[PDB]
Amino acid sequence: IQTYLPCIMTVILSQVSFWLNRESVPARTVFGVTTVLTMTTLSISARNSLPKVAYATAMDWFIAVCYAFVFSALIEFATVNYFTKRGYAWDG
């Protein structure tokens, strides 16, 4: 409930961006950047409990995979925005 739940919740947060319309560039951009920054600060905070061991722990691997998921969610939004041929969204 201190590391694993926050990491899973930020990954599920990044996976909310997929259900928002592609035209909402600011909203999905802030989604991705906020999730990435939250993942970064979570990774930094998690290491503070245990010593400065050189090797990577299982928490480190779980955090790395969650980081890859949120980073890839933002990369996916960037890819979607690359092919976004129009600015105006659906109306009426």
12 forms part of the interface with ligand Y4B (CB under 6 A):
yes
* Region of residue 4 (phi > 0: left; psi between -120 and 50: alpha; otherwise: beta): alpha
Q: How far is the CB of 42 from another protein (least distance, A)?
A: 9
68 alpha carbon, distance to own chain's centre:
8
- Cβ neighbours around 63 below 10 Å, total: 22
34 forms part of the interface with ligand Y4B (CB under 6 A):
no
Q: Which of 13, 29, 16, 10 is nearest to 84 (CA)?
A: 29
Interface with ligand Y4B (CB under 6 A), residue from 3, 9, 15, 76:
15
User: Where does this chain bind ligand CCCCCCCCCCCC (CB under 6 A)?
Assistant: 43, 63-64, 67-68, 71-72, 75, 78-79, 82
* Binding-site ranges for ligand Y4B (CB under 6 A): 12, 15-16, 19
